[PDB]
Curated annotation (Swiss-Prot), chain G:
Pfam families: Proteasome
Official protein name in the record: Proteasome subunit beta type-3
Record's keyword terms, sorted: Acetylation, Cytoplasm, Nucleus, Proteasome
GO biological process: one example: proteasome-mediated ubiquitin-dependent protein catabolic process
Keyword Cytoplasm: yes
Subunit structure: The 26S proteasome consists of a 20S proteasome core and two 19S regulatory subunits. The 20S proteasome core is a barrel-shaped complex made of 28 subunits that are arranged in four stacked rings. The two outer rings are each formed by seven alpha subunits, and the two inner rings are formed by seven beta subunits. The proteolytic activity is exerted by three beta-subunits PSMB5, PSMB6 and PSMB7.
Protein role: Non-catalytic component of the 20S core proteasome complex involved in the proteolytic degradation of most intracellular proteins. This complex plays numerous essential roles within the cell by associating with different regulatory particles. Associated with two 19S regulatory particles, forms the 26S proteasome and thus participates in the ATP-dependent degradation of ubiquitinated proteins.
Modified residues (N6-acetyllysine): 76
Gene that encodes the chain: PSMB3
Lineage, broadest ranks: Eukaryota, Metazoa, Chordata, Craniata, Vertebrata
Length: 202, 123, 199, 217, 213, 201, 204, 220, 202, 199
């Protein structure tokens, strides 16, 4: 798996591949790894499908009640906290690598990382999953402060493309999603749409 | 669970539920006992020989162990309970300790059971 | 290592056990008794692990006795065997399983003599004759060889005598004396120990 | 925690005249991966005590959560009473020991720095509950690379000034960078004095690699 | 995986004379091949006539110590008096036994005066087995210190010798010697040596120096 | 450790060495392995020191309560049976206990051997401990229910000594107790050094 | 552990113009004593003795094989082995079994064959040597023995104040070790004589 | 153990504690850890004492045989080669961690050799349990071309750091200076550890030890 | 460790970090991981120091004899073969990740990879060692066909810089070396000389 | 399990062993002999692992005999013990180690009676009396108790008689008969087996 999220002024961009394997067999080459937690909050999942699915439903339930009870749009930081609470509390029984990104009427666009241990940290952009190891150097040399919902949306497309290229545990189609006050728009990049890089020859 | 306090003290220091229990004992078939030196005896009075009855299934005399036995007077159903509880304690006094049950020990046990039931909620 | 044997006749049941309480390389007790009195016509021959034997045996014991005090009449040897089997089998998958192997010999003034064998797993079987322990391996063939559904207690004590001598011969465990007892319409009768002239 | 995940390396602490100073790089390692390069492994526990943690960052965040609530709770009473450095260090030892005794430890080694009543406080706490006080503290690799330097200095001048001390910390944070493979030359420095707790932004140290040119010779 | 124990070293010694008890321990606290601190004595005052020394896993010594302290306060509120050295020892035994299946990795030595005013020493194993002795040492240097005391304080293996009582003065030097000799062979012993002397007058402390290596 | 107890015409004899080790290190040689349960009951110490002391002390507690509640001393069988019961619950958890419970009942001299393994048996003679096999040797060759008091003392005392000889984990001083109908008496307590310059000196 | 299978203790001390070497006498297999008269110190020439502790078989074997070499050395060379050289000889014999060593840590005590020079040393089961001016220990009670030694040894000692010193170190150390003892033997070597005494000790 | 070496303006300096332990007990308060290879080459050894000895002795012996034929003086690379190729061949079973230093026709050379056989050519190195402590001293106070005395003490300061901070190190600090024309093998160089002054008396007086058998034998 | 080699027209560029650890302790922060095998042939080493050193000396010995015997400059392919032979033959007892690059009067500039298994393959550019995993995506999106001894020499500097940033097992100083007919020039990049990338902030 | 005992007197040496060849739970041989004839004044009492005993014993045997044929005169019991020790200790760290424990009893017409004990590790010790096997644990204390450096062969056969009875009492292994033999200036003399009246 390879997940990633980037923060841009009025919103966020989210990307993930669609590969979910059991061993070396792809049980789903079209998985949807970007899960809606609330109207304008999303999370990217890596790790145990059963664990990330079960945890996300739990947070969605928790958050949905919290907002109706307050009659207000929930904070992105809150959604992150609810994942962090479950992921820290049950860290010995879960295998979840999560990234929470979304828009906040109070804090705007934000991205939080909640890796294996259960820790939580806010970042300009985050990357997770097996494939993430192959795109650190890339991402470090490419990330620019002040990118646009477009530059960003393209920046993750390259990073996910590169990672999908080298990691067996990653591949398929690239799913994206941009969130900003206006709302959420999700697109997909099949075959040719996926950035390409020529395999070195003679 | 039912926690009401059933037996309580009264203005002058009485425990009516006990005094009432004692009354039920009074309305029971007389029972006497004499201590000899080679044989102790016991007899149960007013056995209301309805004849259509069946001797065995109602003898107010029972054995608890192989060295002890007892007679009672009062509410029939209660006696049963207490009888079979002492019976159990008899065999259990042999599993914890190895020696058998004493004359007094078992009696004390029964007294302790009754006393408890005059100071426990719900009973 | 503990040995138990029982032979059912047409009107009685003869049973025997060794009297050694082993520990490490030494016999710690010269006169150990593997039999337990349950009723006036019932015995429970019990062998196994250090605490499990006594604890369990006495437990089934006092519970059979309790039955006597509660109903006036005793349990039939057949009913006791299924009782003890129920408990042992119920503790098998508990926190307190009992690791014991046993024989239940009894006489019913209506059913006759009965000998029951039981696995520490609580498998229950009725049988004309049976044994427990390594000794069983060296002696069950003898019984198959000389046992007849009509053997009289004179014969039986002789068949037993044979098995017992075999252990003095092939078995590598000391085992000098063996408690012996019979059960018939008149209850549980002792018998002299079968002993062997070793220092 | 049975298996630490994202962790922080060594932590240093030395006391000086009228205060104590603590240093910790801002690295959150995940095995051999410098994964989170900008996280604070230091915390301000009320005005007279600060804390630095080595080990599992997630657990540290947890302790940071519970300790923060505790301070808040106390502040609500405004009863003129407030946890002292020794108190926080004592509680932490009870906590770490308690968890160790449930076989579910908080995977951290911590340095408690404090100042109260004109006296300097510096305390150590294991995930097993080993705790003690001393003039200088160094966890992780720091205990093999930094503590020998710190002691060396103190065995010849027990009393340092906020400046002499900060000089030593910088020197150590350099040695650590040169030899601890899981360190990062980007740390913080926390100081406590009658004035309070102060934490200093992303710092670094001058490093000298001139021996690199001594391959042949 | 995860061990809930650690060995911090440090030794503890105690002797009982007609009218005094001595409790000594080095002051080094280590782990692995390192030194946590050079100033960490294992001697602690329980009452005005009872001192305890604890060695082994420092995590447990700390917890144990705080448990003992609290329980003495409780005893005081409950019986209106302080605990006699003997009762403290009896209690410590049960406290150690409550962790019989998850032991306090600890070797304790109690040094003080009995109700009769004489000196007393009690030694314990991690799970509460204990007894009273004339002298005893526990900890790493344990097997290093003992032999010299069996000889010097117990006049063992010596023919035609004068069984003179352990003068508090001779004791105090025996203590310093075995610890100085031990500091030579046990990597755990060193730095310093604190002594606690318990008499009718109270508890007095003395700190001798040892090799810092 | 080497302990033993046998009962004859004049009651029950109980002896034991006094050595306690930690691996090969002699941690003490002043161990009182004859536990003075009550002035009417004696217990031995083999296996785990703390394990025997603690439980038997608990037994002392239980016996005292019993006495106060029945105005009668508890029978040896009963006492040993309490100890057996207390201990059986922990079978499999590592308690280490090898002991002999001795006294004088309304049945005469009493001696029971009790294990942390679950064993509990009455017998004439018993030896427990690493050096037991040795003690058995000399004791068996010399034991008679009809031994005279001063004869029984020598035997027991000898057995324990011979063991301290062969068994490396037995030694120190040799303790000896005598259990008489009224109560028990602490017969002797002699160093092994001395006992040597006598058995051959 | 292999080393403590037979138990045992050995010690060597340095006096002014004399040397001492003592050893317990117990030969046991785990808990059980088997023999009380077990030799652990062997004569390797006059004024030169070697003391072997550890596993009984290798004690005997390392000694016998060492004699083999010592004799030829003395038949080829036209002399009597010098202590520092016998030490180097044992250091070679042991290290030839570096990856399957004999389980014994030797102790050497002696006087120069052509000088006063007292000499003592001990070795690794693999032949690493150690020379000191005071004492050396080997066996299952190294710790107990160091205890005594660091508190009873004095720089210069006449044969008698050395004998009384090494005799106390042993008996007292060996009495806090369950598998060492059953009597102690001492050897005091002087340019003129060899005094051999078997001390009075516990037999438990 | 703490052993270290530094490369200064005129040559090389080697340091080393003097403690030897059998487990967590000190067996030798004064072990000699700086070994002689050639007259211009010395080696400090850490690890399995016996291994550190024999390997060091063998390379020495082989180099005396070597220069005895070439007629020239041994080079450091040669000792380094011989040592590393042997250790490598034993895949780490010969537990020898070495700090090799000497002066060539090519100059002063300082190599660090590990038991598995790899080597490091560096201006300053440390080995042993106290190596991290010592390395701290160096990393903090190291300068190229130091003067004999300016190095001769940086090394005794690093061997000191080890001595106090590592339970595996203690006792004396030995040194070795090798320059284009000198070889100062300073055995005790420092001695920051002294046995505490005996506060009592125990001298065993003749007769205190009961004897069971005596036997004398006169020599000549 | 992080090693890398690139092929450019008349020669090759070679780069490596200087970190060699034992656990988490840096035993040498100035290691020289580029070893001369012959006048114009070099190898980068990763893995067991003892193994790579021992193997390299062996190949140097083997190759030096081969060339004198032929009185000719040795082929780069030959040097690679000699490593591959030892690394395949003793694959169960070695832990060596090697890259061989150099100049050949007959084939020009070339780079060969000989990873763990003992296999050998020629490549436009190669990367090895622990840190290599963090620079695949980078290297894949940056490599350009037709680079110059300068572009290349800078390209590896960035890759090694990035990798050294993320890998604990890599760091220190960046050593380089360019080989072409003319000869071999080796340089080093200390502190500031090392490419830098701003650590993402707010 | 095999038992070996030897008592050295002032002019002779008495030795004995059991005669059981055990396997699993049964005695496979009633009359097994643990002793081997080396010389006219030497015996090697050998016990241990299934093949190692015979193989080794006979090997040391035939090699002692060979010595006789090559020099005309026999090896002194003291010289044989160091021989057998040499081999056993030399095979200890070989591919073919022998797992045997033994006693070497012999008489030298110049040195007198001698009894040697040996560890399978090849540790060699001389001794007045000694034993091997679990029996040794239950009987060595007896010997320490009644052995005197002057015990006569009438006494010795009695002391042995004691140890042997002890095993019939405490030991848990059958062990009914024991081969017995003496060695003096006139060689190796048999003796009646010490047996016990068990079936
Ligand atoms: Mg009716
Ligand atoms: Mg059934
Ligand atoms: Mg049940
Ligand atoms: Mg764990
Ligand atoms: Mg302290
Ligand atoms: Mg040190
Ligand atoms: Mg001589
Ligand atoms: Mg001893
Ligand atoms: Mg003994
Ligand atoms: Mg021999
Ligand atoms: Mg052979």
């Amino acid at each position: 798996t390879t997940i990633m999220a980037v923060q841009f002024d009025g919103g966020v961009v989210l990307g993930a591949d669609s590969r979910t394997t059991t061993g070396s067999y792809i049980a789903n080459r079209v998985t949807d790894k970007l899960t809606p937690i609330h109207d304008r909050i999303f999370c990217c999942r890596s790790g145990s499908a059963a664990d990330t699915q079960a945890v996300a439903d739990a947070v969605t339930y928790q958050l949905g009640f919290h907002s109706i009870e307050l009659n207000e749009p929930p904070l992105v930081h809150t959604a992150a906290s609810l994942f962090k609470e479950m992921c820290y509390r049950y860290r010995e029984d879960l295998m979840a690598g999560i990234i929470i990104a979304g828009w906040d009427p109070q804090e705007g666009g934000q991205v939080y990382s909640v890796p294996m241990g259960g820790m939580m940290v806010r970042q300009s952009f985050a990357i997770g999953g097996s494939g993430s190891s192959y795109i650190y150097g890339y991402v470090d040399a490419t990330y620019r402060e002040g990118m646009t919902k477009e530059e960003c949306l393209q920046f993750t497309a390259n990073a996910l493309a590169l990672a999908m290229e080298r990691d067996g545990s990653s591949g398929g189609v690239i799913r994206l999603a941009a969130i900003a006050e206006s709302g959420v728009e999700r697109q997909v990049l099949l075959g040719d749409q996926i950035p390409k890089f020529a395999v070195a020859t003679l | 669970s039912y926690d009401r306090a059933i037996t309580v003290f009264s203005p002058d220091g009485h425990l009516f539920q006990v005094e009432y229990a004692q009354e039920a004992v009074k309305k029971g078939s007389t029972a006497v006992g004499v201590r000899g030196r080679d044989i102790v005896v016991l007899g149960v009075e007013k056995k209301s020989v309805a004849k259509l009855q069946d001797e065995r299934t109602v003898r107010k005399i029972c054995a608890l162990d192989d060295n002890v036995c007892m007679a009672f007077a009062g509410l029939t159903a209660d006696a049963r309970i207490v009888i079979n509880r002492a019976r159990v304690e008899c065999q259990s006094h042999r599993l914890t300790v190895e020696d058998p049950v004493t004359v007094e020990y078992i009696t004390r046990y029964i007294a302790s059971l009754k006393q408890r039931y005059t100071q426990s909620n719900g009973r | 290592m503990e040995y138990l044997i029982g032979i059912q006749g047409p009107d009685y049941v003869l049973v025997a056990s060794d009297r050694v309480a082993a520990s490490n390389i030494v016999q710690m007790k010269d006169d150990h008794d593997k039999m337990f009195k349950m009723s006036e016509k019932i015995l429970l021959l019990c062998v196994g692990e250090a605490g499990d034997t006594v604890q369990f045996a006495e437990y089934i014991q006092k519970n059979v006795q309790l039955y006597k005090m509660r109903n006036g009449y005793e349990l039939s040897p057949t009913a006791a065997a299924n009782f003890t089997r129920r408990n042992l089998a119920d503790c098998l998958r508990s926190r307190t399983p009992y690791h014991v192997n046993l024989l239940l010999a009894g006489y019913d003034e209506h059913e006759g003599p009965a000998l029951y064998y039981m696995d520490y797993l609580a498998a229950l079987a009725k049988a004309p004759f049976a044994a427990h322990g390594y000794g069983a391996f060296l002696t069950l063939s003898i019984l198959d060889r000389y046992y007849t559904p009509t053997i009289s207690r004179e014969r039986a004590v002789e068949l037993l005598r044979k098995c017992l001598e075999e252990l003095q011969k092939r078995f590598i465990l000391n085992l000098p004396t063996f408690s012996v007892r019979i059960i018939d319409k008149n209850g549980i009768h002792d018998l002299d120990n079968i002993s062997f002239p070793k220092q | 925690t049975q298996n630490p995940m994202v962790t922080g390396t060594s932590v240093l602490g030395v006391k000086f005249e009228g205060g104590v100073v603590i240093a910790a790089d801002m690295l959150g390692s995940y095995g051999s991966l410098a994964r989170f390069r900008n996280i604070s492994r230091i915390m301000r526990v009320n005005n007279s005590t600060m804390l630095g943690a080595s080990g599992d960052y997630a657990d540290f965040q947890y302790l940071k959560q519970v300790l923060g609530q505790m301070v808040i709770d106390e502040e609500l009473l405004g009863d003129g009473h407030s946890y002292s450095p020794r108190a926080i260090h004592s509680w932490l030892t009870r906590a770490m020991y308690s968890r160790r005794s449930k076989m579910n430890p908080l995977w951290n080694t911590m340095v408690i720095g404090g100042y109260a009543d004109g006296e300097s406080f510096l305390g150590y706490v294991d995930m097993l509950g080993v705790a003690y006080e001393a003039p200088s503290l160094a966890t992780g690799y720091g205990a093999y690379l930094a503590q020998p330097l710190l002691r060396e200095v103190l065995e010849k001048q027990p009393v340092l000034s906020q400046t002499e001390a900060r000089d030593l910390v910088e020197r150590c944070m350099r040695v650590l960078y040169y030899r601890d493979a899981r360190s990062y030359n980007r740390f913080q420095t926390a100081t406590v004095t009658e004035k309070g707790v102060e934490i200093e932004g992303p710092l670094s140290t001058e490093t000298n690699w001139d021996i690199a040119h001594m391959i042949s010779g | 995986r995860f061990s809930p124990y650690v060995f911090n070293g440090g030794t503890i010694l105690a002797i009982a004379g007609e009218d005094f008890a001595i409790v000594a321990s080095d002051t080094r606290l280590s782990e692995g091949f390192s030194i946590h601190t050079r100033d960490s004595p294992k001697c602690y005052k329980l009452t005005d006539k009872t001192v305890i020394g604890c060695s082994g896993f420092h995590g447990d010594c700390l917890t144990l110590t705080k448990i003992i302290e609290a329980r003495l306060k409780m005893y005081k509120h409950s019986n209106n008096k302080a605990m006699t050295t003997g009762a403290i020892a009896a209690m410590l035994s049960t406290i150690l036994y409550s962790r019989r299946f998850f032991p306090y990795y600890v070797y304790n030595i109690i040094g003080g005066l009995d109700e009769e005013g004489k000196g007393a020493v009690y030694s314990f194993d991690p799970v509460g087995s204990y007894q009273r002795d004339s002298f005893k040492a526990g900890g790493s240097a344990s097997a290093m210190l003992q032999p010299l005391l069996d000889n010097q304080v117990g006049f063992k293996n010596m023919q035609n010798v004068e069984h003179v009582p352990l003068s508090l003065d001779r004791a105090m030097r025996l203590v310093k010697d075995v610890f100085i000799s031990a500091a030579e062979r046990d990597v755990y012993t060193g730095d310093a040596l604190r002594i606690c002397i318990v008499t009718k007058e109270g508890i007095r402390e003395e700190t001798v120096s040892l090799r810092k290596d | 450790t080497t302990t033993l107890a046998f009962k004859f015409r004049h009651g029950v004899i109980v002896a034991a060495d006094s050595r306690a080790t930690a691996g090969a290190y002699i941690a003490s040689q002043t161990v009182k392995k004859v536990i003075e349960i009550n002035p009417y009951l004696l217990g031995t110490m083999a296996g785990g020191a703390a394990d025997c002391s603690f439980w038997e002390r608990l037994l002392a507690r239980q016996c005292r309560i019993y006495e106060l509640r029945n105005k009668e001393r508890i029978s040896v069988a009963a006492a040993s049976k309490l100890l057996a019961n207390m201990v059986y619950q922990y079978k499999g958890m590592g308690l280490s206990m090898g002991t002999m419970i001795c006294g004088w009942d309304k049945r005469g001299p009493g001696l029971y051997y009790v294990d942390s393994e679950g064993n509990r048996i009455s017998g004439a003679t018993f030896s427990v401990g690493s050096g037991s096999v040795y003690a058995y040797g000399v004791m068996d060759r010399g034991y008679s229910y009809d031994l005279e008091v001063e004869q029984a003392y020598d035997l027991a005392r000898r057995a324990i000594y011979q063991a301290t000889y062969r068994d490396a984990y037995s030694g120190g001083a040799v303790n000896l107790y005598h259990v008489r109908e009224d109560g028990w008496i602490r017969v002797s307590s002699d160093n092994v050094a001395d006992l040597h310059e006598k058995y051959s000196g | 552990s292999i080393m403590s299978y037979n138990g045992g203790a050995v010690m060597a001390m340095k006096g002014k113009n004399c040397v001492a070497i003592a050893a317990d006498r117990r030969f046991g297999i785990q808990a059980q004593l088997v023999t009380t008269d077990f030799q652990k110190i062997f004569p390797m020439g006059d004024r030169l003795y070697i003391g072997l502790a550890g596993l009984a078989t290798d004690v005997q074997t390392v000694a016998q094989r060492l004699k083999f070499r010592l004799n030829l050395y003395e038949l080829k060379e036209g002399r009597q082995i010098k202590p520092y050289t016998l030490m180097s000889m044992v250091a070679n014999l042991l290290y030839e079994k570096r990856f399957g060593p004999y389980y014994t840590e030797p102790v050497i005590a002696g006087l120069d064959p052509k000088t006063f020079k007292p000499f003592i040393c001990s070795l690794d089961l693999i032949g690493c040597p150690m020379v000191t001016d005071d004492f050396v220990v080997s066996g299952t009670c190294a710790e107990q023995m160091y205890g005594m030694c660091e508190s009873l040894w004095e720089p210069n000692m006449d044969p008698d104040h050395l004998f009384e010193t090494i005799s106390q170190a042993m008996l007292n150390a060996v009495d806090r070790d369950a598998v060492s003892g059953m009597g102690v033997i001492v050897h005091i070597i002087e340019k003129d004589k060899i005094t051999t005494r078997t001390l009075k000790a516990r037999m438990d | 153990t703490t052993i270290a070496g530094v490369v200064y303006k005129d040559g090389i300096v080697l340091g080393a504690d003097t403690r030897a332990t059998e487990g967590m007990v000190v067996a030798d308060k004064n072990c000699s850890k700086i070994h002689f290879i050639s007259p211009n080459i010395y080696c400090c050894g850490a690890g399995t004492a016996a291994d550190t000895d024999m390997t060091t002795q063998l390379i020495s012996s082989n180099l005396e045989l070597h220069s005895l034929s070439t007629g020239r003086l041994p080079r450091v690379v040669t000792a380094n080669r011989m040592l590393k190729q042997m250790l490598f061949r034993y895949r780490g079973y010969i537990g020898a961690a070495l700090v090799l230093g000497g002066v060539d026709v090519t100059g002063p050379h300082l190599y660090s050799i590990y038991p598995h056989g790899s080597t490091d050519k560096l201006p300053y190195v440390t080995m042993g349990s106290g190596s991290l402590a010592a390395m701290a001293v160096f990393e903090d106070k190291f300068r190229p071309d130091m003067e004999e005395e300016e190095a001769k003490n940086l090394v005794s300061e690093a061997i000191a750091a080890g001595i106090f901070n590592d339970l595996g190190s203690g006792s004396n600090i030995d040194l070795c200076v090798i320059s284009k024309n000198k070889l100062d093998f300073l055995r005790p160089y420092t001695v920051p550890n002294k046995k505490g002054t005996r506060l009592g008396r125990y001298r065993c007086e003749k007769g205190t030890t009961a004897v069971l058998t005596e036997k004398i034998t006169p020599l000549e």
